[PDB]
Amino acid sequence: KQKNSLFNYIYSLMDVRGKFLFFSMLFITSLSSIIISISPLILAKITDLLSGSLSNFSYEYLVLLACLYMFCVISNKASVFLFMILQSSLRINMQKKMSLKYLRELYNENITNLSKNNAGYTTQSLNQASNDIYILVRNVSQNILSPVIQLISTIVVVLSTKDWFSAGVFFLYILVFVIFNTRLTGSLASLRKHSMDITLNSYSLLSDTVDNMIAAKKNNALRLISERYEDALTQENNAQKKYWLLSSKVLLLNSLLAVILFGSVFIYNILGVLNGVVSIGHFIMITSYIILLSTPVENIGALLSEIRQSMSSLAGFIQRHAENKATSPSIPFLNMERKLNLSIRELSFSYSDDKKILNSVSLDLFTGKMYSLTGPSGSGKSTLVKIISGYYKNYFGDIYLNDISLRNISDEDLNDAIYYLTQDDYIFMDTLRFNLRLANYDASENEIFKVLKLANLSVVNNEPVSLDTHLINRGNNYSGGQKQRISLARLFLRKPAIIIIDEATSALDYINESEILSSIRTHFPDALIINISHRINLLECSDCVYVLNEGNIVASGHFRDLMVSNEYISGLASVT
Amino acid sequence: LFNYIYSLMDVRGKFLFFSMLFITSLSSIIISISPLILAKITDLLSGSLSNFSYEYLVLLACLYMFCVISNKASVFLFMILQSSLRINMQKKMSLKYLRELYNENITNLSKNNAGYTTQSLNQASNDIYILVRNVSQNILSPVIQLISTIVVVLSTKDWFSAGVFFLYILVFVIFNTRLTGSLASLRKHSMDITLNSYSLLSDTVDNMIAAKKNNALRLISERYEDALTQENNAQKKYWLLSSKVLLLNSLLAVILFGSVFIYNILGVLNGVVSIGHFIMITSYIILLSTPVENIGALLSEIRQSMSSLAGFIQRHAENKATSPSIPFLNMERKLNLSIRELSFSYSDDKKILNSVSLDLFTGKMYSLTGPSGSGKSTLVKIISGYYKNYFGDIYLNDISLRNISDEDLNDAIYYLTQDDYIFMDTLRFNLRLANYDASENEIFKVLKLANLSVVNNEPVSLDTHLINRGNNYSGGQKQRISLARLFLRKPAIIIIDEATSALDYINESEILSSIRTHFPDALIINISHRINLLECSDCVYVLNEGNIVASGHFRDLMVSNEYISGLASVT
Ligand SMILES: Nc1ncnc2c1ncn2[C@@H]1O[C@H](COP(=O)(O)OP(=O)(O)NP(=O)(O)O)[C@@H](O)[C@H]1O
Ligand SMILES: Nc1ncnc2c1ncn2[C@@H]1O[C@H](COP(=O)(O)OP(=O)(O)NP(=O)(O)O)[C@@H](O)[C@H]1O
Numbered sequence A: 001k002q003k004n005s006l007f008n009y010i011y012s013l014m015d016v017r018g019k020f021l022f023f024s025m026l027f028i029t030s031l032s033s034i035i036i037s038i039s040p041l042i043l044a045k046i047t048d049l050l051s052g053s054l055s056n057f058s059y060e061y062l063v064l065l066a067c068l069y070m071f072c073v074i075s076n077k078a079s080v081f082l083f084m085i086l087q088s089s090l091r092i093n094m095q096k097k098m099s100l101k102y103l104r105e106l107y108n109e110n111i112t113n114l115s116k117n118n119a120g121y122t123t124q125s126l127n128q129a130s131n132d133i134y135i136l137v138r139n140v141s142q143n144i145l146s147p148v149i150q151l152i153s154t155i156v157v158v159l160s161t162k163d164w165f166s167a168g169v170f171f172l173y174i175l176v177f178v179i180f181n182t183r184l185t186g187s188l189a190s191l192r193k194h195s196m197d198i199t200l201n202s203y204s205l206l207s208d209t210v211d212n213m214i215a216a217k218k219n220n221a222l223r224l225i226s227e228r229y230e231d232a233l234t235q236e237n238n239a240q241k242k243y244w245l246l247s248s249k250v251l252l253l254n255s256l257l258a259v260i261l262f263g264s265v266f267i268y269n270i271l272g273v274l275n276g277v278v279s280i281g282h283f284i285m286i287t288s289y290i291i292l293l294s295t296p297v298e299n300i301g302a303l304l305s306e307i308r309q310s311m312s313s314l315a316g317f318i319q320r321h322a323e324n325k326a327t328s329p330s331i332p333f334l335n336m337e338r339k340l341n342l343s344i345r346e347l348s349f350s351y352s353d354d355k356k357i358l359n360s361v362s363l364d365l366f367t368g369k370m371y372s373l374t375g376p377s378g379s380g381k382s383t384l385v386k387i388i389s390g391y392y393k394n395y396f397g398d399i400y401l402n403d404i405s406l407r408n409i410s411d412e413d414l415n416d417a418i419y420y421l422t423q424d425d426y427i428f429m430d431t432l433r434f435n436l437r438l439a440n441y442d443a444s445e446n447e448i449f450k451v452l453k454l455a456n457l458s459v460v461n462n463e464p465v466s467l468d469t470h471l472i473n474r475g476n477n478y479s480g481g482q483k484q485r486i487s488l489a490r491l492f493l494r495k496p497a498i499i500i501i502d503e504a505t506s507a508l509d510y511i512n513e514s515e516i517l518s519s520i521r522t523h524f525p526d527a528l529i530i531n532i533s534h535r536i537n538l539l540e541c542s543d544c545v546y547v548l549n550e551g552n553i554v555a556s557g558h559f560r561d562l563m564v565s566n567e568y569i570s571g572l573a574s575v576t
Numbered sequence B: 001l002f003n004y005i006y007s008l009m010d011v012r013g014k015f016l017f018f019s020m021l022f023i024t025s026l027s028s029i030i031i032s033i034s035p036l037i038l039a040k041i042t043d044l045l046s047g048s049l050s051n052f053s054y055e056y057l058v059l060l061a062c063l064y065m066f067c068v069i070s071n072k073a074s075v076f077l078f079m080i081l082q083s084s085l086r087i088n089m090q091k092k093m094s095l096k097y098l099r100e101l102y103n104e105n106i107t108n109l110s111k112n113n114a115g116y117t118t119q120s121l122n123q124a125s126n127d128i129y130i131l132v133r134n135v136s137q138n139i140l141s142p143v144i145q146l147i148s149t150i151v152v153v154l155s156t157k158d159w160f161s162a163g164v165f166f167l168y169i170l171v172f173v174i175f176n177t178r179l180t181g182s183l184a185s186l187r188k189h190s191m192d193i194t195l196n197s198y199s200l201l202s203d204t205v206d207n208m209i210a211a212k213k214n215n216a217l218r219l220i221s222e223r224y225e226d227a228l229t230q231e232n233n234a235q236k237k238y239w240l241l242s243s244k245v246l247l248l249n250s251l252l253a254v255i256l257f258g259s260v261f262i263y264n265i266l267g268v269l270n271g272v273v274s275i276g277h278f279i280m281i282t283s284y285i286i287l288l289s290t291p292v293e294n295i296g297a298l299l300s301e302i303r304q305s306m307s308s309l310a311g312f313i314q315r316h317a318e319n320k321a322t323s324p325s326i327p328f329l330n331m332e333r334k335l336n337l338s339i340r341e342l343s344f345s346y347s348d349d350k351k352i353l354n355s356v357s358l359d360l361f362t363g364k365m366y367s368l369t370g371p372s373g374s375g376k377s378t379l380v381k382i383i384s385g386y387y388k389n390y391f392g393d394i395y396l397n398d399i400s401l402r403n404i405s406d407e408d409l410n411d412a413i414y415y416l417t418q419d420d421y422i423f424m425d426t427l428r429f430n431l432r433l434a435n436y437d438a439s440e441n442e443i444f445k446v447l448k449l450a451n452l453s454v455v456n457n458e459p460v461s462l463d464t465h466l467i468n469r470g471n472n473y474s475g476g477q478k479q480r481i482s483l484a485r486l487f488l489r490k491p492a493i494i495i496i497d498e499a500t501s502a503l504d505y506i507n508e509s510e511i512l513s514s515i516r517t518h519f520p521d522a523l524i525i526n527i528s529h530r531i532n533l534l535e536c537s538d539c540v541y542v543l544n545e546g547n548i549v550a551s552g553h554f555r556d557l558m559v560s561n562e563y564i565s566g567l568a569s570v571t
């Protein structure tokens, strides 16, 4: 069942030009195997015409024979060059379509599955998959029809000249070969997959070390960093050597079998020529067939290995990239209300198992009101807002948005209704314009510049900020606070009902913090605001404060009513 | 270049490489006898065909078989040695890269992402592979087969054949070298765009959650699709030139070798040339394609994998200023900091530090504050040796920073960065980053001082597996990992750049208390917007638009300075 899905996926990557290039590759490979299967006859015809006669034969017929053999050899080589020209053209063609499908497939994945592996890994995963497709495209377009044509014609013709021992041992070889190899193909595929996986692990550890180089540099940790890579490389070499040995043995055993079987057919026809039983023309034809048969035998060996091993390694890739999906019912045409209220009823959550992060959170929040959420680091403030923000769907209990449950809300609509300002910043290595256009694609040059003022990012160091400012990897081109302001400027282009600010202002100074937080409430008057903070001034300003402790909501109401009642907020209000 | 490739080969690597060269050379000697054995077989066919002529035909046919078998055994043996050599050279190549990346400056490291550096290793590994191959296979072997051909065809006194044969190798080597550089440039430019494309994929995948939550599929997809279009166009440009060279080389061969075939046909028809010689000539025309092909590769592949490997060495071994350093420096337990008229720019376009003049001392805690963009991080980064292109001077008890080795500076100063850098590994590994030789107890002791020894009423294991960017942990728990590292280290200066922002007052004060206790003589610079640290410091420094605008005690500043007055009013 998964076998059919695989080839349909490869076929789909080919546009009209892609389908032509693929069929041209199949045709030219097939045509040349027909032509080259003729050539050992031509050689035999040349041999007899000369053998015996003492220069007494048609010199014009020898020239015609020699020219036909040349046409065979030329057309077979033109075919090789034409196939590789078509192959690269098809690689180029299928490449773009393959890569975008991956990016779009990665966008539709869940946050839990995305977080599982880094960029180093996903980047080299595309690499392995692309190459896997390439191999499969080749093995199909080249090693299916062509070796069958050359093997059929060879047994048919040798059978026609009534040589039973030759055609017999020839057919015996293809039989022993196809059996022996298939009885060892899976054993290679498994050893190759296991290797390729360790290779991903190794690219993953390189990108992990390079992304955290500054940390390792400043801790003078070259030895610790170098040794954990050197260990990964050692796991890679050992996995590669294990494949190499099996691969090397199969090749040597297949070579020794060929020498024993085809060697006998060569000795048999030698004795046949020495005892006048067999003609020289025929001897040359059997000798010519033994030599010609190696390439179709090679193309079969390849197919039996390469098709099974690239199908296994490609199966594993499609699995860890299209599998993880619970249900998600969603609503067909939903047009969310400008005013939305939040109702969390007996919400429970665990990231893994054995440990519960949210015990039985029961809350009720309303339009145009600001709420503060606090608690110790590990209580689950981020977790709770992430679930509200649809990061996770494996939760016990229910969450409503004006009667409508989250479970029945499409990820697109939820993201239009709620805007989560994350604890960590996510700045794209691109222009400032690009980072803000992330919030709204259709936004004009003015709408974007207006938003810079609202986030206090219109002027940096007495200089006006350009929308064309190039932003380095992780936006480390900008200060901690300037990073927070990019993410804040995004909110102003968006139009949400709920606004979550998870410690999203921590890097800003008192002036900026207050001015932006002011501008938020001004620009979004009816917006429900959840604010996560460990700071009294941010807790004070709220219409109501919620204290989360070890998963459960332990305290509610006004900050003043809590600053003495509650154990945690009294701990905060220890200073001054 | 070739010395760098040679160095990647250990003793087993050098054997495998020479075995590859030998076997390729030996097989070209053997296969160059082949057209003469075919001639003798054609000669015997037009003879008497006596018992001895039949026996000689068989012994001849056996020698041709030995040629064909030994040539194929050589191909299989070469590919077995090649993969063994690839495996061998692989590890050594990869570590040299990681170690080369560690020795690079922060400014140059920040220039490109992991997606880029990962695929950069890929391209160079493959460029080495190609070079190892074209050298071990396409140098001696085609020369042997081309020499013996002209020698033997010259011996049989066929001038037109050996003439046009030598003419072809001459026109070929000229025509191709004329277009090799044009191919290498088109290939390099393509491979570079390919890096750009892998860079944009890792950039998008690292910030997927942002793009997902902003429903930005179209903007994200469009950007990548543009990069892929820049990739296809760069690839198509190489493809066309590559395809033309191949078709023109093929058409030249058909015209030149086709004439040698027609000439010897007419020679056979007019009794001038024997059939035995006519076969030997076509047998040489057919045999010559593989050495012509290997020269076609050698010419084109050696140049294009040298161009793209030149680039890789340039961007991974250059951009070093000076660094005089110090031979054997043993830094004093007590160190004072003296910044004199410090000025700095990142891209020279704008000044970040105007003329910072400061003086700090042992065992005292100092607070640094100012608006976001003043340059607090910049200043401590320069103190921590992130950047060396600065005007003014920085001393450490008479010794200038310029004369301090990056290893010694990192042992004297410990910078707790604004953003956290958690390794995807065990908690043990993340803490061993600070001190390799640390025992299981030294590490757990440090977990208590970091307030990380217990998470959710459960004792924290040193074997806790930490996901990409440590997102397996809470904002504050991340900060605590970086804080726990400091307790294994032994510095004179301790910089805390907003490194406790994700912590509540209790823990912030509690960890900062255990820092001062465990490091009594340590000079502490604290960057904070909050007041629970500014009030605790021995002196406060206010940075505004590059210049230090206010100094002294916090209480004396919330009277004098409006910024410090307004900040304290947040009570
Ligand atoms: N992806 C994850 N996988 C497993 N456990 C996690 C993950 N993220 C967080 N946790 C744990 O879940 C608990 C609460 O997580 P989180 O919601 O980030 O907390 P928080 O209470 O908001 N803390 P903070 O923001 O630092 O002050 C902590 O004990 C974390 O260790
Ligand atoms: N790597 C960089 N490349 C270019 N400019 C930079 C870089 N890092 C910082 N800057 C700029 O230098 C100035 C000061 O940066 P930084 O030292 O991080 O500031 P900060 O004043 O400490 N702000 P913060 O800690 O966010 O509240 C700002 O104008 C930044 O945009």
Ligand SMILES: CCCCCCCCCO[C@@H]1O[C@H](CO)[C@@H](O)[C@H](O)[C@H]1O
Pocket: A043, A046, A065, A066, A067, A069, A070, B031, B034, B035, B038, B279, B282, B283, B286, B287
């Ligand atoms: C035009 C009349 C017939 C020509 C004589 C028959 C021999 C055909 C040429 O054989 C070639 O010999 C080479 C070594 O000499 C091999 O490397 C090559 O694989 C093989 O294809």
Ligand SMILES: CCCCCCCCCO[C@@H]1O[C@H](CO)[C@@H](O)[C@H](O)[C@H]1O
Pocket: A036, A039, A040, A043, A046, A047, A284, A287, A288, A291, A292, B038, B041, B042, B064, B068, B279
């Ligand atoms: C001309 C009379 C003397 C000929 C005696 C030697 C036998 C030549 C065998 O050559 C083989 O012929 C095949 C034909 O298809 C090619 O595929 C193959 O590469 C080549 O090796």
Ligand SMILES: [Mg+2]
Pocket: A380, A381, A382, A383, A423, A502, B474, B475
């Ligand atoms: Mg949190």
Ligand SMILES: [Mg+2]
Pocket: A479, A480, B376, B377, B378, B418, B497
């Ligand atoms: Mg800073």
